[PDB]
Write a protein that binds this ligand. Structure first.
Ligand SMILES: CC(=O)N[C@@H]1[C@@H](O)[C@H](O)[C@@H](CO)O[C@@H]1O
Ligand SMILES: CC(=O)N[C@@H]1[C@@H](O)[C@H](O)[C@@H](CO)O[C@@H]1O
Ligand SMILES: CC(=O)N[C@@H]1[C@@H](O)[C@H](O)[C@@H](CO)O[C@@H]1O
Ligand SMILES: CC(=O)N[C@@H]1[C@@H](O)[C@H](O)[C@@H](CO)O[C@H]1O
Ligand SMILES: CC(=O)N[C@@H]1[C@@H](O)[C@H](O)[C@@H](CO)O[C@H]1O
Ligand SMILES: CC(=O)N[C@@H]1[C@@H](O)[C@H](O)[C@@H](CO)O[C@H]1O
Ligand SMILES: CC(=O)N[C@@H]1[C@@H](O)[C@H](O)[C@@H](CO)O[C@H]1O
Ligand SMILES: CC(=O)N[C@@H]1[C@@H](O)[C@H](O)[C@@H](CO)O[C@H]1O
Ligand SMILES: CC(=O)N[C@@H]1[C@@H](O)[C@H](O)[C@@H](CO)O[C@H]1O
Ligand SMILES: OC[C@H]1O[C@@H](O)[C@@H](O)[C@@H](O)[C@@H]1O
Ligand SMILES: OC[C@H]1O[C@@H](O)[C@@H](O)[C@@H](O)[C@@H]1O
Ligand SMILES: OC[C@H]1O[C@@H](O)[C@@H](O)[C@@H](O)[C@@H]1O
Ligand SMILES: OC[C@H]1O[C@@H](O)[C@@H](O)[C@@H](O)[C@@H]1O
Ligand SMILES: OC[C@H]1O[C@@H](O)[C@@H](O)[C@@H](O)[C@@H]1O
Ligand SMILES: OC[C@H]1O[C@@H](O)[C@@H](O)[C@@H](O)[C@@H]1O
Ligand SMILES: OC[C@H]1O[C@@H](O)[C@@H](O)[C@@H](O)[C@@H]1O
Ligand SMILES: OC[C@H]1O[C@@H](O)[C@@H](O)[C@@H](O)[C@@H]1O
Ligand SMILES: OC[C@H]1O[C@@H](O)[C@@H](O)[C@@H](O)[C@@H]1O
Ligand SMILES: OC[C@H]1O[C@H](O)[C@@H](O)[C@@H](O)[C@@H]1O
Ligand SMILES: OC[C@H]1O[C@H](O)[C@@H](O)[C@@H](O)[C@@H]1O
Ligand SMILES: OC[C@H]1O[C@H](O)[C@@H](O)[C@@H](O)[C@@H]1O
Ligand SMILES: OC[C@H]1O[C@H](O)[C@@H](O)[C@@H](O)[C@@H]1O
Ligand SMILES: OC[C@H]1O[C@H](O)[C@@H](O)[C@@H](O)[C@@H]1O
Ligand SMILES: OC[C@H]1O[C@H](O)[C@@H](O)[C@@H](O)[C@@H]1O
Lengths: 166, 314, 314, 166, 314, 166
C-alpha cells in the first residue's frame, strides 16, 4: 500500500471488528473496548461502491449478427470476419484484464489512504497529550477513562483540559 | 487507544498491477459465465420461424404459408428451417437474411402483374400443398401449349411508398434442353432485371443434374432493393419465375439462431444460440457470437474486482 | 498562519474512477463537436470532379472532358457526379474508386492500337458531344459494313514504365441479337483479356432491356492493373469496346465525398461529407466516417478532462 | 483525495485566493493577510499542463474511406464493414471514457499531494516553535509579525532565533 | 543520521502520464525490434513447398510430385512456388490456401471413378513429366476418337469419413471451338457439380487466347468441401477435368510466406516473411503481418518501461 | 512524486549508495558511514519486478494469416482487410503507449511512497529523542555512536534508554 498504513506500520487487522472497516481499540484504566469508526468506513465504502457502479453499465450498443451457425457463409469472407472478431476478442480481453488489474491496485491503495487519514486525524487531535509509538497506538499521558477514550472517537477530545495534566 | 482496520480469516485472491493473487477482504466477479438455456422473450413480439426458412417467408414455400406477412421484435431461425420447395438456392442469401432479420417483419402488396398468351399455373409435387402446387408469392409463368413459344414479355413495377421495396424473381434451370423448349419456347432465353441503380441479366443453364425432392431442374431466386419512386423492369422470354408480390420492412427487429425453447417469463437483450446471457457485468465468457445488447466477450473465465482493503489475518 | 488552496463559486462537473459528476475547479472538453461546413483546402491542390464521375475520368464521357488527366492532393466526388454516357455499369467499381481516390491524379498515354478492315467510329446520341459522339479514351471498334463480320482481331500492350498501369476495356450488350449481328459480325462473340496474373473472358448478353438515355443496349467497363514490364493481351471478335489509352497514378492524394463548398482560406486534414473537423482534440462525435488525419470517433458527446483540483466552495 | 488534505482536514478552499493555487493566510499581532504560494502552484499547474499536452497529440494516421455515401457498396461486404466500424467505435468510446475518468481521478489526487506537500513543508520548517491544530493552521508560539509570517512563506524562518522564545 | 535513496550519473529517459522524457534510474524496452532472419523450426515438422504451389499439392503438377500427401506443423510457401501446369487459374484460390495452410497436411484417397467409351489419357507438354503427361491427382477425360462425342456421363462420390473432404475438378477452356468439338463431342457442354449444401454449374469458354507455356487453352480448377456422409455428384458431357482423388486434412498446422532459410536450431512461434520474431515483449515494430503467437504490432519504435525510481543526480 | 519525498524534501539521491535502493547515512561522534536499507529496497524491487512480470505474458492467441505477399487478393476485400488491420494497429499503439505511460507514472510514485515509508519509520522510532530538520536528516539529541546509529537501522533503538538523555 502506497501509504504504508494497511499491511504496514499497522501489522495486521482485527478479525473481531465486524462493525466497520476501521475503528478504535483502547485500553483505559478500567477495561478495554473495540468500536468501529463510521466516518472513515463510509468514506471508503462509498467510493468503492463508486467504481463497482462505474463498471456495471449498459452497452446500449446492439450488434446484429453477421455469421451463420446453420449454413456457413463463403470461406474468404468467413475467415476475414473471424480474423476480425478474434482481433476484437484479443483487444477486449486485454482491456478487461488491465481495467480490473489497474482498478484493484488503486482500490487497495485507496484504503491505506483512508486508514492513514484516520490515524493522522487522531494524532493532530491529541495534540501534545499523547505519543506516537509506531504500532498504530496512542499512549495517552493521562487517565483516559471510557468517557475519555470515546471522547476521542466522536472527535470532541479537548487536549487543553488535560494539556498540563500530560 | 489504538486504531486499526478489519480483516477476515479467508480472504479472496485478486490480481493487482504489481502482484498476483493477493488476498483482499472481498471481491466480486466481472466476467459473466451463467447462461439461461432459453430465449427470454418477455414483452417482445416473437416469431419462431420453425420449419420455415427466413428467406422462405419472401418466396412462399409450404413451410411458410403461416409467415408470408409477419410482425415482430424478435425473429428466430431454427436449424430445421428451409426456404425451399423445388430444389435450388438463393443467390447472395446471407445478405438477405441480414436484412430481413432486422426488418421488423414483412408486409406484402401485389406487383400488379397480369399476363397474356401464356399460362400462370406451373406447379410441382416438389412444392406439395393442397395436393401439388407452386410457391406462393410467386407465379411460374409458363408457355401455353407444349414446345410453344414464350412471348417477348415485359413487366414493370414502381415502388410508390416512402420506404424501399424488396423485389424477388427466380430463374428456372430445367433438367435438360428438351424440358426447356417444352415448358417455354425454344432457343436462347434471356431475363434482364433493371432499375435505377441496378442492372444484371440472367441466362438459364438447362442440363443434367441430380434429382432432389423429385425434380432435376432448379429454380434460383434473385433480389434487389427498390428505392422510393424508382421503377424495376423485367425483360424476359421464359424460364422466368415472376414475383407476384413485393415486400416492405415494418421497422426494427432482431434475428437470432437458437436451438433452445422460448420463454416469456424472463427478459433478455443478449441472445445467442443456446440461451440468453442475463447479466449486468461488463464481460462475458459464454459465447463470442452472442448478439443484441451484450457484455463484451473475453478469453478469461474470471477477472475479480476487489471491493475491499487488503486482507491481513492475525 | 494557515495554508490552504483556491476555489470558485461555480465549479465544473466531471467523472472520476470512483465518483460521477464531481466539481473540480476547472475542466476542458475532449470530444470535438464543432464542425466547419466547408472543405478547408488551403495549400492543397484541389479538384472538384463536379458533374464528372471519378470513374468517368478514366473512360471519357462528356462530363469529364476537363478531367481526363488531372493532378491533385484532394479529389472530390459530388452526388451529381456520373461516370457514364451510354447506359451501363462499371464492374467492380468501388475498388477502382478507392484506387483513383489516392492516385494523386492520372496521366494518359496511348495504347498504340491501330486497326484494319473495321471501323473505329461508333458514336451515340447518348454520349452527346459536339453533336453526337462516343466516350473519349475509348474506341468503339465496329464491323465495317452492316451485318458484316468482325475479324479474329488481337491487340496487346506492354507497360514499360516503373509503376503499374490501369487498363480498361468495355463489353457492349446490344439491345437484341439483331442489332448485334449488325454492328459486329454474327454468331458467338468472345472477348478474352489476359496478363501475367490475370485472365478472364467475357461474352456479350444481347437482348431486350429498358431504354436509358435513348439506348437499350449497354456497355459495361472492365479493368485490371498491369505490372511493370508485363504485357496485356486482348483477344476478341467484336462487341469489344477497346481502350485507346492507359493510365498511371501520379502519387499521393485523398478522395472525399461532400456536398459542401470548397474554401481555400481554412486548413484541414480531417474531411467528411459535411465539412472539415478542425480540432486538436483526441475524440470527435461529429461523423463516424470522417477520413484523413482525424480524432477517433466515439459515442459520447462530451468527456470532460479536469484541469484543476477538486472545488470546495465556502 | 488520497492524501486527506484537499476536501479533507482543510475544510474548504479560499475563493479570494485568485493569486495562485495554494497560499498562506496568517493572523499576526497587527493585521492578517492572504498571499498565494508560487512554488506549489506552479508544480501542480506544470504537471497538469503535462497531461493535457499528452492528450492533445497528432494521429498522423490517415485513413482513406472504404464506404460510399452516394451509390452504396454490396450488402454483404457493407454490413461486414460497418459491423467492423462499430466494433471499433465501441472500443474507442470505451477507451475515451476510461482515459478521461482515470486521468481525472489521478489529477484530483495530484493536488491533494501538492497541497499536503506544502503543509508538511511548513510543519517541518517551524520545527518545535508552533503546534499543529488540525484545520490546517499553525499557531505560532511567539509574536510572528508581518516580516515574520512572510519569513515563513519565502522559506527563511530560522526557528532557532525564536526557539527558546517558543 | 540521515536517510536517502540511490541515483546514477546518466539515467534513462521515459514518458510519464504527466511529463515527457523524465530520467529514471533505469528502464527497459517494451517494443521488440530484433529480428531473426531465419525460420526457426526446431521441434516442428516442417515442409518447405519450394517450387511447388500450395494449391498444386492438391491437383498434382510436376513441381509437386513430392508433396501430394504431406504431414506437417509448419508449411512454407515460396515466391517461386507455382500451382500450375497447363496455363490456368484456381477459382477462389486464397480461400483454399487459407484452409490447406492449417490442414496439418493432406491425405489422398481415390474417388473410385471408373469410365467407359472414353479415353482417360489426355496429356500435354505443358505438364512435362517423364516426357509429357498431365497433372497427377487428375484425369483429363477425353472423347475417344477425334470429333467424337462425349457421353452423358455422371460420376458421384460419398465422403464416408468423420471429417469433411476437399473435392476438386477442372473445366477445360479450349483455344477454339474447333479444338473443343475435337477433344470432346460437339455442341453445348455443361458440367454441373452438386452436393447437399452446394450447387453450381459450369460452361466452357473456348476461343482465342494467348499461348502460355505452349498452350492457348486453359483449365480452371474448382472446389468444394464435402461434409461427412454427404454425396457429391458430377454431371457433365466433356470439357471436364475429373478428380481422381479426394483430400482430407490431418489436423493442426500453420502456413507462412518467407524468402528466408529454415533453421532447426532456434525456436519460434511468431513467423513472418523475413524471419521469426523471437521475444517475450508485448509489442513489436517489426512486421504488421507477422503470424502465429506474436506480440501486438504497434507504430512506436520504442516504449520504455521505468524499472526504477526517478533519478536525481547530485 | 505524489509523496513529496523523492525529488522532494530530499534534494537528490546518493550516487555512492550502490548497495541498495534506500539507506542510512549518519555522522556520529567518531566517523560517518553509509549503509543501504535492505527492507525498503526489496519491497520496491519486488513490486516493480511485479509489473515487469505482469507485462511479459504469452499471447497464446494464434492468428493465421489472411493476406498474400505473392499473388495479391482481390482489391475490394484487400482494402477492407487492411483498413481493419490498421484500425487495429491504431488501437494497440494507443494502448501500448498508455500502459507504459501510465505504468511509469505509478512506478515512480511507488518509490516516493517506499522512501517516505522508511522516513516515517525512522521518525516514529526515534520518538521524542531527535528532531526533524527537513533535508531528511535526524539530528539525534545524544551521542549516537556507531553501535547506536546502527541500533536505529536494524530497528532496535529503544528511545527510552536515552529518553531523558535527550
Ligand atoms: C463460437 C461459436 O459460435 N461456436 C462454434 C461451434 O459451434 C463450432 O463447433 C465451431 C466450428 O464450426 O465454430 C464455433 O466454435
Ligand atoms: C454516419 C454517416 O455516414 N451517415 C449516414 C447517413 O447519411 C444515412 O442516413 C444512414 C443510412 O444511409 O447511414 C449513415 O447514418
Ligand atoms: C507490411 C508488409 O507486409 N509489407 C508490404 C511490403 O512488402 C510492400 O512494399 C507494400 C506494398 O505491396 O505492402 C506492405 O508494405
Ligand atoms: C469459416 C470458419 O472458419 N468458421 C469459424 C467458426 O466455426 C468459429 O466459430 C468462429 C469463431 O468462433 O471462427 C470462424 O472462422
Ligand atoms: C462472503 C461475503 O462477505 N459476501 C459479501 C457480499 O454479499 C457483498 O455483496 C460484498 C459487497 O458488499 O461483500 C462480500 O464480502
Ligand atoms: C472559466 C475559466 O476560468 N476558464 C479558464 C480557461 O480560460 C483556461 O484555458 C483553463 C486552463 O488554464 O482554466 C479555465 O478555468
Ligand atoms: C449498408 C448499410 O447498412 N449501411 C450503413 C450506413 O447507412 C451507416 O451509415 C453505417 C454506419 O453509420 O453503417 C452501414 O452499415
Ligand atoms: C545499465 C544497467 O544498470 N543495467 C541494468 C540491467 O542489467 C537490469 O536488467 C535492470 C533491472 O535489474 O537494471 C538495469 O539498470
Ligand atoms: C491491396 C493493398 O492495398 N495492399 C496493402 C499492402 O501492400 C500493405 O502491406 C498492407 C499494410 O501493410 O495494406 C494493404 O492494403
Ligand atoms: O460446441 C458447440 C457446437 O459446435 C458445433 O460445431 C458442433 O460440434 C456441435 O455439436 C457443438 O454443440
Ligand atoms: O446446436 C448446438 C449443439 O448443442 C449440443 O448440445 C448438441 O445438442 C449439438 O448436437 C448441437 O449442435
Ligand atoms: O439431440 C441433441 C443433438 O444431438 C446431436 O448429435 C445432433 O443430432 C443434433 O441435431 C441434436 O439436436
Ligand atoms: O447530403 C447530406 C444531407 O444533408 C442534409 O442537410 C440534406 O440537405 C439532405 O438532403 C442531404 O442528403
Ligand atoms: O436542398 C437540400 C437537400 O434537400 C434534400 O431534400 C435533397 O433534395 C438534396 O438533394 C438537397 O441537397
Ligand atoms: O442525416 C444524414 C443524412 O442521412 C441520409 O440517409 C439522408 O437521410 C439525408 O437526408 C441526411 O441528411
Ligand atoms: O521479399 C522481401 C524483399 O526483401 C528485400 O530485401 C529484397 O530482397 C526484395 O527483392 C524482396 O522482395
Ligand atoms: O536478390 C534479392 C532480391 O532482389 C530483388 O530485386 C528481386 O529480384 C528479388 O526476387 C530478389 O530475391
Ligand atoms: O520493403 C518490403 C518489400 O516491399 C515490397 O513491396 C517490395 O518493395 C520489396 O522489394 C520490399 O523488400
Ligand atoms: O431521418 C428522417 C429523414 O432523414 C432524411 O431526410 C431521409 O432519409 C428521409 O427519408 C427521412 O425521413
Ligand atoms: O454439454 C455441454 C455443452 O457442450 C458443447 O458446448 C455444446 O454441445 C453445448 O450445446 C453443450 O451444452
Ligand atoms: O520502396 C522503394 C522500392 O522498394 C522495392 O525495392 C520495390 O517496391 C521498388 O519498386 C521500389 O522502388
Ligand atoms: O439540419 C441538421 C442536420 O441534419 C442531418 O444531420 C443532416 O440533414 C445534416 O446535413 C443537417 O445539417
Ligand atoms: O468437438 C468434438 C465433437 O463436437 C461436436 O460434437 C461435433 O463437431 C463432433 O463432430 C465432434 O467430434
Ligand atoms: O535492406 C533492409 C530491408 O529493406 C526492406 O525492408 C526490405 O527490402 C527488406 O527485405 C530488407 O531487409
Amino acid at each position: 500500500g502506497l501509504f504504508g498504513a494497511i499491511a504496514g506500520f499497522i501489522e495486521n487487522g482485527w478479525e473481531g471488528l465486524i462493525d466497520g472497516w476501521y475503528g478504535f481499540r483502547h485500553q483505559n484504566a478500567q477495561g478495554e473496548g473495540t468500536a468501529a469508526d463510521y466516518k472513515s468506513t463510509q468514506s471508503a465504502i462509498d467510493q468503492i461502491t463508486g467504481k463497482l457502479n462505474r463498471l456495471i453499465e449498459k452497452t446500449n450498443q446492439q450488434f446484429e449478427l453477421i455469421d451463420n451457425e446453420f449454413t456457413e457463409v463463403e470461406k474468404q469472407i468467413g475467415n476475414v470476419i473471424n480474423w476480425t472478431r478474434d482481433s476484437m476478442t484479443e483487444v477486449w480481453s486485454y482491456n478487461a484484464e488491465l481495467l480490473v488489474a489497474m482498478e484493484n491496485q488503486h482500490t487497495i491503495d485507496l484504503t491505506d489512504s483512508e486508514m492513514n487519514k484516520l490515524y493522522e486525524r487522531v494524532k493532530r487531535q491529541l495534540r501534545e497529550n499523547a505519543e506516537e509509538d509506531g504500532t498504530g497506538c496512542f499512549e495517552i499521558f493521562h487517565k483516559c477513562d471510557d468517557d475519555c477514550m470515546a471522547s476521542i472517537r466522536n472527535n470532541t477530545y479537548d487536549h487543553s483540559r488535560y494539556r498540563e495534566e500530560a | 487507544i489504538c486504531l486499526g482496520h478489519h480483516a477476515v480469516s479467508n480472504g479472496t485472491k485478486v490480481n493487482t498491477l504489481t502482484e498476483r493473487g493477493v488476498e483482499v477482504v472481498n471481491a466480486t466477479e466481472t466476467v459473466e459465465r451463467t447462461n439461461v438455456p432459453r430465449i427470454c422473450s418477455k414483452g417482445k413480439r416473437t416469431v419462431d420461424l420453425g420449419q420455415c426458412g427466413l428467406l422462405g417467408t419472401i418466396t412462399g414455400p409450404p413451410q411458410c404459408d403461416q409467415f408470408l406477412e409477419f410482425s415482430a421484435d424478435l425473429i428466430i431461425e431454427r436449424r430445421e428451417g428451409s426456404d425451399v420447395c423445388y430444389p435450388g438456392k438463393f443467390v447472395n442469401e446471407e445478405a438477405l437474411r441480414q436484412i430481413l432479420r432486422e426488418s421488423g417483419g414483412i408486409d406484402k402488396e401485389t406487383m400488379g402483374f397480369t399476363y397474356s398468351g401464356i399460362r400462370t399455373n406451373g406447379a410441382t409435387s416438389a412444392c406439395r400443398r393442397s395436393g401439388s402446387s407452386f410457391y406462393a408469392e410467386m407465379k411460374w409463368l409458363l408457355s401455353n401449349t407444349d414446345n410453344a413459344a414464350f412471348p417477348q414479355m415485359t413487366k414493370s413495377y414502381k415502388n410508390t411508398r416512402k420506404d424501399p421495396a424488396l423485389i424477388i424473381w427466380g430463374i428456372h434451370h430445367s433438367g435438360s434442353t428438351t424440358e426447356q423448349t417444352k415448358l417455354y419456347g425454344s432457343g436462347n432465353k434471356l431475363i434482364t432485371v433493371g432499375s435505377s441503380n441496378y442492372q444484371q441479366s440472367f441466362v438459364p443453364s438447362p442440363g443434367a443434374r441430380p434429382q432432389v425432392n423429385g425434380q432435376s431442374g432448379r429454380i434460383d431466386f434473385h433480389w434487389l432493393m427498390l428505392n422510393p419512386n424508382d421503377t424495376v423492369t423485367f425483360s424476359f422470354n421464359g424460364a422466368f419465375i415472376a414475383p407476384d408480390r413485393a415486400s416492405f420492412l415494418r421497422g426494427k427487429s432482431m434475428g437470432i439462431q437458437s436451438s433452445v425453447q422460448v420463454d416469456a417469463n424472463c427478459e433478455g437483450d443478449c441472445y445467442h444460440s443456446g440461451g440468453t446471457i442475463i447479466s449486468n457485468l461488463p464481460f462475458q465468457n459464454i459465447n463470442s457470437r452472442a448478439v443484441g445488447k451484450c457484455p463484451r466477450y473475453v478469453k478469461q473465465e474470471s477477472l475479480m474486482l476487489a471491493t475491499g482493503m487488503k486482507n491481513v489475518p492475525e
